[PDB]
Amino acid sequence: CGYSDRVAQLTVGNSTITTQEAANIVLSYGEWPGYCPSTDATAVDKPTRPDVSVNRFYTLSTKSWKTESTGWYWKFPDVLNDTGVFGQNAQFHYLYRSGFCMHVQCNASKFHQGALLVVVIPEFVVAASSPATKPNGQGLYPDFAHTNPGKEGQVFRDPYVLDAGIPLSQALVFPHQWINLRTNNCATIIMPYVNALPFDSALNHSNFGLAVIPISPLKYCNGATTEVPITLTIAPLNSEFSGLRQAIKQ
Amino acid sequence: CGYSDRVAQLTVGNSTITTQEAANIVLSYGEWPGYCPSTDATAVDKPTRPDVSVNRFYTLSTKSWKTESTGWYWKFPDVLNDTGVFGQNAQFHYLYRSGFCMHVQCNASKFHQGALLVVVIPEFVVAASSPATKPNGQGLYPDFAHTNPGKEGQVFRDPYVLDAGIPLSQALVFPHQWINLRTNNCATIIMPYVNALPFDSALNHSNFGLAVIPISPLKYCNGATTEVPITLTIAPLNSEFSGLRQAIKQ
Amino acid sequence: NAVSTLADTTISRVTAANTAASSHSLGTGRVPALQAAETGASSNASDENLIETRCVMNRNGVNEASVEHFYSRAGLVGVVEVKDSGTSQDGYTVWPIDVMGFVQQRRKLELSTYMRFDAEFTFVSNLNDSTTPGMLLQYMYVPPGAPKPDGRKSYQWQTATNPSIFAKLSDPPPQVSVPFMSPASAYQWFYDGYPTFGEHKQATNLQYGQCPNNMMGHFAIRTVSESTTGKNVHVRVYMRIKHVRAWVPRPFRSQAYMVKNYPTYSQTISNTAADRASITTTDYEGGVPANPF
Amino acid sequence: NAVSTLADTTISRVTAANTAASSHSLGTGRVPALQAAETGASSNASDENLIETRCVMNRNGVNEASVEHFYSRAGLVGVVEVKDSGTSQDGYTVWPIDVMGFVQQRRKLELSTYMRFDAEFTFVSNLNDSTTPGMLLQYMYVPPGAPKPDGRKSYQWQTATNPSIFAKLSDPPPQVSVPFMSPASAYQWFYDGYPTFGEHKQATNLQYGQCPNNMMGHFAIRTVSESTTGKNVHVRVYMRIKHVRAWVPRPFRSQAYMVKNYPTYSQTISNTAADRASITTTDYEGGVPANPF
Amino acid sequence: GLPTELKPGTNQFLTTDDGTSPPILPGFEPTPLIHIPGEFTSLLDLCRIETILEVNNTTGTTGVNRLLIPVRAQNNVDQLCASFQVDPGRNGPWQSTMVGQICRYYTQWSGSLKVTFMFTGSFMATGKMLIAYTPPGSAQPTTREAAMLGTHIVWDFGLQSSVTLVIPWISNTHFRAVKTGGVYDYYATGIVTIWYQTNFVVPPDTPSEANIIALGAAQENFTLKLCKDTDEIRQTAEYQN
Amino acid sequence: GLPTELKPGTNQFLTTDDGTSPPILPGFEPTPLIHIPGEFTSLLDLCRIETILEVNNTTGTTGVNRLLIPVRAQNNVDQLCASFQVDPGRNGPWQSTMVGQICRYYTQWSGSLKVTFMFTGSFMATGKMLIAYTPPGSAQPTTREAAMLGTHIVWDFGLQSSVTLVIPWISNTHFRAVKTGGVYDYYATGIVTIWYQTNFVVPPDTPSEANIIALGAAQENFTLKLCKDTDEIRQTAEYQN
Amino acid sequence: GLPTELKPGTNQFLTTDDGTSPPILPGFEPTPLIHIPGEFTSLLDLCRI
Amino acid sequence: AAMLGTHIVWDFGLQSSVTLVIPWISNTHFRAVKTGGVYDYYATGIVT
Amino acid sequence: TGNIATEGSTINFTNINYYKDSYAASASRQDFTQDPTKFTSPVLDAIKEAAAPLQ
Amino acid sequence: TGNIATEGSTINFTNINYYKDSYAASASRQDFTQDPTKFTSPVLDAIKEAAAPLQ
Ligand SMILES: CCCCCCCCCCCCCCCCCC(=O)O
Ligand SMILES: CCCCCCCCCCCCCCCCCC(=O)O
Ligand SMILES: CCCCCCCCCCCCCC(=O)O
Ligand SMILES: CCCCCCCCCCCCCC(=O)O
């Protein structure tokens, strides 16, 4: 063809996401999610692959976008670590690995405007800003709420530095996609398992951060619908759990 | 077959040991005792091989196992250096070499319990424990009775450190076998000649220490036979003596 | 043979992409300029399609923008002070091996998330007056869980197994090759998680972000002496990464760092770009326009 | 030729044993789990038979758990003090060559009963203030029965046949290769017997356990001077075993050593394992159980 | 072989010397390397990523607002919308781009740069913008008629929200120095000004002010030279965290 | 050849440098090597030997008693018989094993471990024991129902007095650090608990209390890395015997 | 190879010594050489003017 | 709660329609048309 | 074809490892790789230059 | 197949003896041997894994 079709259908497990304004799908680092090969595998326990049970689209969080909204982030797999069969497999097992299919849905009329950058940041170490007054302010280490927001996600306090002391302008280095209410209304990022280790604990370690930041603020004329939601839908892909024991929640 | 038979018969010289609970025979370092080859031989005197006269089972020491017994050890060939034709060949000659077939016999009823570790320790240098009070206590060097117990053997004072400052737990590194009164009633260790020199003085140097240590103490209910003996039977194999002179006893 | 092998060892010149000659394109349907940043892909448009270009056979070399070349340069990673005077007469110091201590090296390495490299460590050692007398020093690498020395003369300096380096301050700086030492398959400057299970409900969440896959033990450094020398020794440790593979590029840090092992920034946000008077103001005088058209 | 020989000199990677994929085994007759420790043999049971394993093509290297690698590391075996001040103005010392003096090296070597190795000896020499002036020193190896020097300037330092090493403290440490020197076919850290015939009825049985097959002479060390220098010199001797064969493994020593040439332990028996409150007590917090099932 | 003579450079430690050093751990085999996605081997790969230019780097503007070029319906034709110089080294809008930050690790650079402009008005908003690039000789064009004489693209807003102004490599030298200002204005690359070709037209009940997001990168012919330490980060002294 | 220049690392003495030194005795031929039984060339051979675990490493217990797990007829089902962590480095029952002592000479370890349990009750004594291994996430199971969800073996006492619990290598990393505690609890291997599957049943006139002897070793896939000096022995100072 | 002995002339700096020195910039590729008229390679060419 | 069952996210655009295929997830090969009472054994499900 | 900035090749006795461990070797900088697409064009539907990207 | 932790082999001028005595040579660590049986299974009757050891 040589052009990305506007209309697109994403079907994983017993869930289907249809979008009529898909601006193409990003495949992070041009690599598809796959099961750990024999050569990379270190751990001798046979790994359970629940397939359709865990590999399906989960619609976890919807957020209201406002003119002064600063942005939201989630941590994968932390966001899903307590939802559905995935959550149970993740609590019951030690080692964990999967890629995911992100899909951020934000529609507005042809008379609204604004741009959301949706970016997947591998190893998103949330920083804590210390007030200039004291060199070691108590808020030098971010509390558990900020590092692991869970399903509800967390509001950025300083989205300019992506709450990590790195410029948002250069965040486009990570797998990203824009939602221009002018052109599109969804952002899809397929991400393979990215980690130095072949399997990691779902609970202790977060492979990726999912950040939705409004660059161009949402603006509209009096009379349009003020409530414009942003919905995060995530589908784990090629999930593999190992090291079965007593279910542990975080 | 792929399994060790329970019932076993050991015939060396004019002596035969029959056992109906043999837990297999240990061949130390997977090497059989053999005569010194021409290449390893340093000493030009033709070596006497008395064969059946010296190579036969000698039943030297029987010990009464009690609930608080701490263990016994012997030194080979010191244990046999005064018994039978072997003893005479060992006194009359300077150089000496042979492997041996250990066989520790300990039967008890199906209503007694306990475990003896029987282990052959090459170069078993008996230590002397010095009391904390004085740094150089007179008992810093073990007297001749402890280093060379002879036929009667010597009681361990600290079997936990095998009276040598090395943990008994790791003694299983040496050729060993257990006597579980549950399973078996004999322990056989065939040991080849292990020394840096091809021939050594039987009297001055002890190639191996024979240690029987009760790990699990002997326990039984009122009414069972309290007297449970442990008998050491040793058969030198491929004995070779050289350098004939006046008989010297130790 | 292996002779032909030595001949082809000089770094060869890889050139940059050439430009092809292009003419005008007055047609509908073909629109190289129009892109869609929303898709997440960078513009695919070339110079030849936007303007009329000439043929340029570009001979500029690209061999130096490599992760090998970028990082294969020794930088200061630690300053160990072996105090042996005044209140501090220990005459030994145990320095935790970390490369996140100094901005210039930290910021370079944090371009990547994961890196697998061998390093070369050089010890430039001297006194307060920059003098290097005939003074013997022991540099002992103490891997994680090896006992750390508690005194100038302790048993830990026997080094039956710990690798140590004896050198005089007088000698040229000691240097050694160190392998890729890490349980994980690569190092990891950013670890988004906790090393232990728990609920992490501490008024000070220190444990967050600290992967021991990176912590590679200590270097213990002493003056091999019997008593206080009454002289402090500065040991500048220089690390030159080599055999370098890097994964997942990240934004270069903008904010000034505050602590060693934690990305943390002052609540005063320094802008990435130095500001100017107005959005239509440029600092360039240029020349005198011929028709003021 | 000998070129191909140099190509294959880099230590090659030997991998560890791979795991094969396994499924469930619901049959009688086949019992991999059941063993008999009484036989004296270690369990033959593999992971694949006890649990369902996946295929793992293990690429972990085993080349470093070798008796070559374990022991080919220089460790402190002696400290010779060449006293030339105060009461001790000899300006020479004769040090009996023994490697059983310092725990870290002793304990490693006593893993074996017999060992045959060449060694490399390094002499790190310096003053009390860790300073290395231009001070000339003579290290003379005195084989067993060679006359030992009785004075700073005696005839024994002519070294017509004794190997000696002249070096300044100023120079990098002297090093030499030493062969396997022993009447016996291997060295022997444990000798269970007496070196002489007799009845051994002494209130102090010193002779027990002392094989002269190990005693390899002395090193005599002097400052090549005419008179008292008024300075003491410390000579740390470092031995790196090489070309190493070892026989009959032994338990690693648990108890602290007391004297040099005799296994002897305090009547206070330090337990091999650090004790804990109860047999059902483990020090691990773990995480918050999801169903407290 | 045995007769040797030491030349100058002995006992020195050049930090950028590529040499061998004795290994500290005989027979050490490192952890097996597993496959990790997103390996990069070159920093010119990193330069060809579009990242946001901080064109609104003004006294007042703060945070994410600095990344937006404001646009609106004009009462007067041919007013200047924004303007920025296109030398990555220079303190200015290029500092916020990965290309601008990698350039400051090198002394000299060459090849075409690439600015992508994404418009983020409502679907109903239409307009045309003349994005002109002026080669080094001239000042920032005072009128649109001055600018149109340089390399320019007229950009029409429609379904495709983005356009790309390739800044061609027009240099006397094969490589420009990253350092600029003073005698180093010899390597000034030029200015890029955005003019209104027509007005920003909206229907009733539509916002009449929107934003353009500029994304800077480098083309395939882009090259760097002479690795040097960056200006962009500072700790207090040699002894700090 | 003759023109040389000395690089950093000259005049240094790295203890673990594998080099040549001049020989002190020209033409010396060592004693001929005779054949000695029990040559070992690898320390992984030494790790695959079963040696006794000091599971009863408690305040009170002394000497050989520390090597015995006591068992007895229980009035109550599903009580915890014993429990130990399975990381060889950790101060605890593994210190008494050859594998545990060789691990402390290395920084990192990998591969399956192996615990063999030999029962030493009377022939007439019968019983079943659930020996469960819990992977790193969880605490020591408080009930048998918690433990059964991990890798376990039910062991029946009979003519074969021993059983083997292979502890499978379930690690995120290819190698665990031997050092544990603090942030190094990241490499915690897990806990092994022994529960009564049924009771320890004896007839009249038989002892109702016996012992289990645990023997720890390593499997064929076991590997070590990064030789370091051990913690396990200490003299007072650098100048001692 | 390993056994070496330094001869006179060591640690000296002869200005007209033609030798190698370690390069300060790994992997540096200089600007391409363009054709410039009036290259001279010899000073005897300059003497014949 | 609902997202954990067979679902379709439907975006309004030029195509005004979408199709939720209700898959046949039954224990039995055939459900009875009659429902309510013990016949709630053959309840097909809810669509929200 | 080197960085000599003049005609000449000479003889190249360089990149020699003098130790049994291969990680002791000089920086491995013989090979240069430039694959930018995994970061610049990670989309599934490859877009031709000419064609308008969304249709 | 070395410990370099990246693609590369280079040239290996190592393991050279410069003295007439061969015991002057560098540590002989080219060869690795793993024969554990002489210590782990020294029994005469080899026992198969499957079979119950004593019968
Ligand atoms: C005696 C001196 C020998 C040299 C030994 C050097 C050992 C260095 C270990 C490897 C260094 C790279 C890892 C650095 C990671 C630390 C970063 C951090 O987590 O803060
Ligand atoms: C001038 C210096 C030359 C070096 C000569 C070194 C000679 C060393 C002899 C070989 C050392 C190994 C044997 C050690 C045995 C001693 C142990 C003991 O019995 O206490
Ligand atoms: C000490 C001998 C080293 C030999 C190294 C190879 C030299 C080959 C001669 C040609 C120069 C290399 C470049 C070329 O092939 O033109
Ligand atoms: C001074 C000349 C030394 C020559 C050493 C041999 C080098 C052979 C070239 C190939 C590199 C070795 C490893 C391999 O065979 O791939």
Side-chain angles (χ1 to χ4, degrees), chain A residues 14-21 56-59 84 105 185, chain H residues 3-16 18:
Chain A
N14 60 305
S15 62
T16 295
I17 309 293
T18 76
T19 187
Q20 311 220 40
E21 307 291 312
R56 62 180 299 282
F57 280 98
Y58 293 98
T59 313
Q105 298 171 330
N185 66 13
Chain H
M3 66 157 294
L4 293 161
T6 295
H7 67 273
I8 186 164
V9 173
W10 170 31
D11 182 38
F12 303 161
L14 311 188
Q15 273 62 23
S16 55
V18 65

Side-chain angles (χ1 to χ4, degrees), chain D residues 16-59:
Chain D
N18 299 346
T19 300
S22 184
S23 76
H24 59 93
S25 186
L26 305 168
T28 78
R30 174 192 209 262
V31 298
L34 296 187
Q35 298 289 335
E38 290 87 28
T39 63
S42 307
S43 156
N44 43 51
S46 292
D47 58 354
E48 67 182 8
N49 285 320
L50 270 290
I51 57 153
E52 286 195 28
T53 52
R54 59 162 317 155
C55 179
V56 171
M57 277 167 65
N58 195 352
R59 292 202 282 117

Side-chain angles (χ1 to χ4, degrees), chain D residues 51-72:
Chain D
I51 57 153
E52 286 195 28
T53 52
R54 59 162 317 155
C55 179
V56 171
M57 277 167 65
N58 195 352
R59 292 202 282 117
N60 294 353
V62 297
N63 295 124
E64 190 163 24
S66 293
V67 302
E68 201 62 51
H69 285 127
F70 185 65
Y71 283 122
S72 281

Side-chain angles (χ1 to χ4, degrees), chain C residues 97-100 117 121 123 139-141 163 165 176 178 181 187 189 214 216 219 261, chain E residues 24:
Chain C
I97 189 67
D98 64 340
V99 303
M100 304 279 106
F117 55 84
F121 278 79
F123 301 92
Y139 304 87
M140 180 172 74
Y141 170 48
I165 316 164
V176 289
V178 178
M181 289 189 287
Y187 286 124
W189 311 125
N214 277 18
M216 292 301 112
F219 302 153
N261 283 335
Chain E
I24 58 157

Side-chain angles (χ1 to χ4, degrees), chain B residues 6 28-29 31 40 110-115 159-160 167-173 176 178 180-183 192-198 213-217 219-222, chain F residues 34-38 49-52 54 63-64 66-68 95-98 101 118-125 157-159 161 203-207 209-211 213 215:
Chain B
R6 270 286 180 95
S28 310
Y29 308 122
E31 189 183 334
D40 296 349
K110 298 180 178 289
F111 288 71
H112 291 79
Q113 73 181 28
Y160 183 58
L168 182 56
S169 46
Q170 277 159 240
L172 274 69
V173 163
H176 71 105
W178 299 80
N180 209 354
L181 294 174
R182 182 175 174 84
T183 313
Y193 186 68
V194 178
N195 199 36
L197 307 167
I213 296 103
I215 305 299
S216 177
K219 194 188 310 305
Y220 56 90
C221 277
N222 185 310
Chain F
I34 68 161
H35 175 65
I36 306 172
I49 304 169
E50 303 310 303
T51 56
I52 314 187
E54 210 157 292
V64 175
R66 297 173 71 85
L67 299 163
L68 304 164
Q95 274 187 284
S96 65
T97 57
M98 182 53 78
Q101 293 296 280
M118 193 186 87
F119 168 70
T120 62
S122 63
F123 181 86
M124 292 303 171
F157 303 161
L159 311 188
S161 55
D205 305 319
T206 293
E209 179 212 12
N211 296 306
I213 298 170
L215 306 189

